[PDB]
């Protein structure tokens, strides 16, 4: 009963602490640094195998192999250097929304409107990719999945809740139930100890993987958050939303540090990714294009405009050599 | 300039490409339908006759054409996001329980939202006004009147184009045509030429529903071809 006014007071005091933290703004500090200038990336590769819209892609840790998921029901594992199709995995359910390449490279996860995270073994003795397991337990569509290890996978769902699964047992090791809207994206921290998830409630929550609780919540966005990506050092993360803006939040400072928006940009953001150094924030848009922002200065450093439909997915290699961009035009373009 | 083990990898990729063309043939030949509707709509009976688990798949054939219907059965009471997965689908089969005037405004708001969805702009809606037997029974009994929920029904008259061939009661024709007009009003009000609504009057046990879907999908494909050739 009185707990509502208690929550209001706690929110006000959290805002007061955040304001006390706001002695300056990134923009003020970044003014002195030299501008990234104008970046021009070219499409080195085009991957043409998918029959339908591509909804997700994930780079392998080798920075050469790449898994992409299409609504044709088919994961494709690509050799980025040669454009060779290493694998073509037919999915049981065609309405895939996410796909993840295990850091070991032994497995690929996917899932979607079927509320299942399917783990496929890419390293069978039979020589064919097979379903390792079907993680069931989410009551909504699977929106994002990321391996933390060949046995541990964290998934986000339309059930407004994330879940860490033990793949061997097929059970949710822990569940994260702080969100009030569909969770669209999750990003693991570099050390894998924490992960951030953005939901349709316009908030991004930082989660402790071990403890299973939300450490911090961030609420700058005015609309659904579709994409979330940690900064390279793990002390900050960027969120892309339907608000047509991206936002860089800092964990330590526990608030928004910068907003990346432009008047000419009115479409929502579908994907976000940092460069290796974190100086470039690459964000895909519903405008069949992608914007490369100066993460420190908030200027639009460049554009990747080689897609005939919405840019669904975006990913920078671990070594930072290239950036892949999948699209509803059924193609994936590697940019350098 | 490729090693022996690269040439073989390229050959494997070529074999995958051949399999992908084989799959593309099927993907193109198959028409994908999104079955939407409220819990009372009766969509479950429709799919049964046509013949966690987040999405249910039904397969059927009409005139050697393959239809894959998808009923998103286990999701939250919110579609803003997952509905985006269903663009280009050959059609949205939207089922509405006509006999329930209490929820008719809710069904109209749902149809609006679907029709005005920015990602469903080019997707046509086959509108199944299901449970017509119940609507006729309710209208003839007289216990409940549509007017109570839709005052415009008091000042609405059947158009001269109405075709009650089976010989239904005039009151039932007026009611069902008012409901169909209520949905077609939203349909026309906004998006025109980019997507059409195909209203149908169907009962729970109707054997013609698959034929209705096939005809409306044929017209949708014809409209796509016409637009491709700038004929519409």
């Amino acid at each position, epitope marked *: 009963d009185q707990l509502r006014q208690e929550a209001e007071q706690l929110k006000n005091q959290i805002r007061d602490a955040r304001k006390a933290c706001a002695d300056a703004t990134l923009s003020q500090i970044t003014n002195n640094i030299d501008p990234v200038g104008r970046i021009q990336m070219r499409t080195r590769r085009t991957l043409r195998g998918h029959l339908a819209k591509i909804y997700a892609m994930h780079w392998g840790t080798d920075s050469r192999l790449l898994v992409s998921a299409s609504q044709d029901g088919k994961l494709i594992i690509w050799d980025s250097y040669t454009t*060779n199709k290493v694998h073509a995995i037919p999915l049981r359910s065609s309405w895939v929304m996410t796909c993840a390449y295990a850091p070991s*490279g032994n497995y690929v996860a996917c899932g979607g409107l079927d509320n299942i995270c399917s783990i496929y073994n890419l*390293k069978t*003795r039979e*020589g*064919n990719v097979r379903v390792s397991r079907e993680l069931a337990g989410h009551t909504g569509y699977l929106s994002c999945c990321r391996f933390l290890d060949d046995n541990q996978i964290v998934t986000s769902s339309g059930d407004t809740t994330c879940a860490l699964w033990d793949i061997e047992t097929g059970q949710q090791t822990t569940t994260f139930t702080g969100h009030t809207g569909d969770v669209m994206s999750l990003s693991l921290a570099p050390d894998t100890r924490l992960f951030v998830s953005g939901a349709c409630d316009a908030s991004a929550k930082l989660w402790d993987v071990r403890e299973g609780m939300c450490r911090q919540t961030f609420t700058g966005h005015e609309s659904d958050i579709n994409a979330i990506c940690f900064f390279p050092n793990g002390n900050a993360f960027a969120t892309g939303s339907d608000d047509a803006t991206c936002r860089l939040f800092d964990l330590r400072a526990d608030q928004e540090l910068m907003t990346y928006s432009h008047d000419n940009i009115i479409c929502g953001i579908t994907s976000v990714s940092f460069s290796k150094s974190g100086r470039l924030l690459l964000a895909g848009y519903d405008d069949f294009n992608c914007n490369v922002w100066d993460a420190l200065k908030a200027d639009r450093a460049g554009v990747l405009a080689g897609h005939d439909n919405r840019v669904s997915c975006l990913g920078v290699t671990d070594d930072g050599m290239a950036v892949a961009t999948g699209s509803w035009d059924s193609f994936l373009k590697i940019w350098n | 300039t490729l*090693s022996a*083990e690269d040439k073989a990898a390229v050959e494997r990729s070529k074999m995958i490409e051949k399999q992908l063309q084989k799959d593309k043939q099927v993907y193109r030949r198959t028409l994908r339908l999104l079955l939407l509707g409220a819990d009372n709509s009766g969509k479950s009976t429709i799919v049964k006759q046509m013949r966690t688990s987040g999405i249910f798949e039904t397969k059927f054939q009409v005139d050697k054409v393959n239809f894959h219907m998808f009923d998103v059965g286990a999701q939250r009471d919110e579609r803003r996001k997952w509905i985006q997965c269903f663009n280009d689908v050959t059609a949205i089969i939207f089922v509405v329980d006509s006999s329930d005037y209490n929820r008719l405004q809710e069904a109209l708001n749902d149809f609006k939202s679907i029709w005005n969805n920015r990602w469903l702009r080019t997707i046509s809606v086959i509108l199944f006004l299901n449970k017509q037997d119940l609507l006729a029974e309710k209208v003839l009994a007289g216990k409940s009147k549509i007017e109570d929920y839709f005052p415009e029904f008091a000042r609405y008259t059947t158009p001269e184009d109405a075709t009650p061939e089976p010989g239904e009661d005039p009151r039932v024709t007026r009611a069902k045509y008012f409901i169909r007009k209520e949905f077609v009003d939203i349909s026309t009000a906004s998006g025109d030429g980019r997507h059409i609504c195909y209203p149908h009057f169907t009962c729970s046990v109707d054997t013609e529903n698959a034929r209705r879907i096939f005809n409306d999908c044929k017209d949708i494909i014809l409209q796509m071809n016409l637009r491709e050739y700038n004929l519409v």
Partner: single-chain antibody
Amino acid sequence: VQLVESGGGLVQPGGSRKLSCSASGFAFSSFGMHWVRQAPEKGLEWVAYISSGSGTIYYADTVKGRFTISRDDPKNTLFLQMTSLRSEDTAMYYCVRSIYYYGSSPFDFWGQGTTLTVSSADIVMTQATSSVPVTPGESVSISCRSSKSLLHSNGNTYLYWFLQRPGQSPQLLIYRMSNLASGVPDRFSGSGSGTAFTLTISRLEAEDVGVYYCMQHLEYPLTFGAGTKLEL
């Protein structure tokens, strides 16, 4: 994974014989296949290759025109038809699976083999010592040299190390001069400078006793080494 060779036996010179290889326990269709013959008390020598699918068939010059390699995927059976057999064709013929894609390990499984008794641009593989007595627990090194560098422009060095224990079919140990094959203890390590390569067994055991063969996969004649024996 099972590759069972059949056929073979005693054949009069100049005759014909159809060796067969039944494959079970793996996706035979997706694997390229090789026939590799081992003459009695002699080293391994590659015979024939048929890629996944049926394209890219290759033969050793010693059998071109006489041997024809085929496969029936529905029955999962590889075939080697021999037309005019010679005394030099007496050997144990091994069925080898090899799947080629980035990061793959070809030649990873060999069948038990079938005995068949008959009544200059190739890369030469040289092994320094045909025999090297050694004791368990000691770190022993086996050497290989290639007349042509096996380092390709793509960064891969196509050197394969196989171990054939007595009375057993060869087993893949290393497949790109450094990559340990699945199921092979870490005892075995591979290294090379682009034209000379070394296989090190750090803690040799009784199960490591056998003949170690080197193979090049740069060019498809797939020349093996003479084989370095290990005895205790």
